[PDB]
Amino acid sequence: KTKVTFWAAPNPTQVKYWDEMAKAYEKENPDVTIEVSQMKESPSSEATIQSAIASKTAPTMSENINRSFAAQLADSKAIVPLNDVKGLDDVVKERNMSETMDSWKFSDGNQYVLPVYSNPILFAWRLDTLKELGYDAPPKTYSEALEVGKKLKAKYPDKVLWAKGDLSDPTAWMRWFDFFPLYDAASKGNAFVEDGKLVADDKAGTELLTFMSELQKNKLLLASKATDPFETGTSIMADNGPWTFPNWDEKFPELKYNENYAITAPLVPDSMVNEENVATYADSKGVVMYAQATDKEKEAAMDFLKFVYNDDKNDLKFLETTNLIPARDDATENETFTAFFKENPELEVYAANVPYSIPAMDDAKYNDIQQIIGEEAWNPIVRGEKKPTKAWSDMKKAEDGVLQ
């Protein structure tokens, strides 16, 4: 008998999902044991994993791995290429996730992670406020956003377009919720950094900063502490993930999809007013397999995943219980999910955007790389301390430093 140890995310509901999958798999394969446990945060999941590698107590597999962290683990050879474990292609094929999987491809040609969920970062809009200003739908381009903004200030001078303290904070991860969604949309998914080199789209980058400076100049940004600004009326646009809906169900029950709030892709430059399928950043994590595992343990692990993704109903169950969007390309058209999306139209918009979203960069120094984005260009523009051109150049020069 072979034993696979599986470390699930630090959340009871997600752990239960995996455990139920494990028990059903064991009924079908009596010679294999899939032991699921909830990963400890000591103080974070990443430190728990780093410590296990060091003490040689890594499990066979764990989920909860984002692309940047996977790049660190791959560089130290603590995890193995999944494409070297028989069964990977079968999993990708059956779950209809080829486009999503392809976006994860690493610089060396290997795939180190099997994405579990992929939550595109979209933007919520206050339709009620937009209607008071004469609009029936959210603007799509930077210029349209600016005209909405002028009308907003004329009727409500204390309101802003975007209110979030994180906008002026240089913490690296925060960029995944402001800069990346807009940059990915403007550059049609440019990787910013790839294969250890700065491949940033200068045009998209500088025009995004120009747009932000205009918002800043017209008092359309609020980068200070503010409680529930979007829900209480201070702002009319907010970056938003699926996890916000259960919260609104509780605290803001009057917010209703397509009545008082809308969900859309990030704003794009005017030149792309006609583009369908706008890209954004995807908050996505998945499964990796540790080098410490034997080949039989690794194949057994992949066979388990093959079992899990052989029935579309399992992804439906994942979505309905964890509220995390499954990393597949066809959810909105697949009849398995029709009834659910019919009842949850707001989640359908998220599922519709998965194949066009781009995950975090596959570079081990993502922390310094991303902190520079905020410190040198984003935070200064939000605070009106630098001009767009100078900010972008200050950023590029600093990135070169980190990348040697």
On whether both 2 and 94 belong to a single domain, the answer is yes
**Do 135 and 162 lie in a common domain?**
yes
Q: Are residue 32 and residue 114 in the same domain, yes or no?
A: yes
The answer to whether residues 109 and 146 belong to one domain is no
Same domain, 160 and 273: yes
Omega into 246 within 30° of 0, i.e. cis? no
* CA dihedral over 261, 265, 266, 270, signed as positive or negative: negative
Q: What are phi and psi of 344, to 5 degrees?
A: -125, 65
The verdict on 255 and 404 lying in the same domain is yes
Q: In whole angstroms, give the CA distance from residue 393 to residue 386.
A: 11
User: In the chain, what's the furthest Cα-to-Cα distance?
Assistant: 72
DSSP letter, residue 239 = E
What are the beta bridge partners of residue 124?
Answer: 238, 263
CA-nearest of 361, 339, 208 to 272 is 208
- CA-CA distance, 375 to 393, in Å (whole number)? 13
Question: What is the C-alpha to C-alpha distance for residues 160 and 182, in angstroms, rounded to an integer?
Answer: 18
Method: X-ray
Q: Are residues 90 and 45 in the same domain?
A: yes
Say yes or no: 31 and 116 in one domain. Answer: yes
Q: Pairing relation of β-strands 280-289 and 61-65?
A: antiparallel
* CA–CA gap between residue 233 and residue 230 (Å, rounded): 6
Together in a domain, 259 and 370: yes
CA dist 14 and 16 (Å) reads 5
Domain carrying residue 180: 121-280+362-404
User: What does R_g of the chain's alpha carbons equal in angstroms?
Assistant: 22
For the domain that residue 132 is a member of, what is the CATH number?
3.40.190.10
* Strand ranges for 121-227 from DSSP E: 122-126, 160-163, 193-194, 197-198, 221-222
d(CA 107, CA 49): 23
Of 108, 130, 10, 20, the closest CA to residue 62 belongs to 10
Structural domains of the chain, count: 2
Q: Are residues 261 and 306 in the same domain?
A: no
Amino acid at 119: N
Q: In the 3-class helix/strand/coil scheme, how is 244-290 assigned residue by residue?
A: HHHHHHHHCCCCCECCCEEEECCCECHHHCCCCCCCEEEEEEEEEEE
Resolution stated for this PDB structure, in Å: 2.1
One domain for residues 114 and 191? no
Buried b (16+ CB within 10 A) or exposed e, 287-305: bbbbebbeeebbbbbbbbb
Burial class, 258, CB count within 10 angstroms (exposed 0-12 / middle 13-18 / buried 19+): exposed
List of residues 6+ apart from 269 with CB closer than 8 A: 141, 142, 186, 204, 207, 208, 211
> Are both 125 and 247 inside the same structural domain?
yes
* Residue written as token pair 């339709």: 127
For the chain, the helix, strand and coil percentages under 3-state DSSP, each to the nearest 5: 50, 15, 35
Cβ atoms of residues 75 and 21 within 8 Å: no
CA separation for the pair 299, 3 (Å, rounded): 11
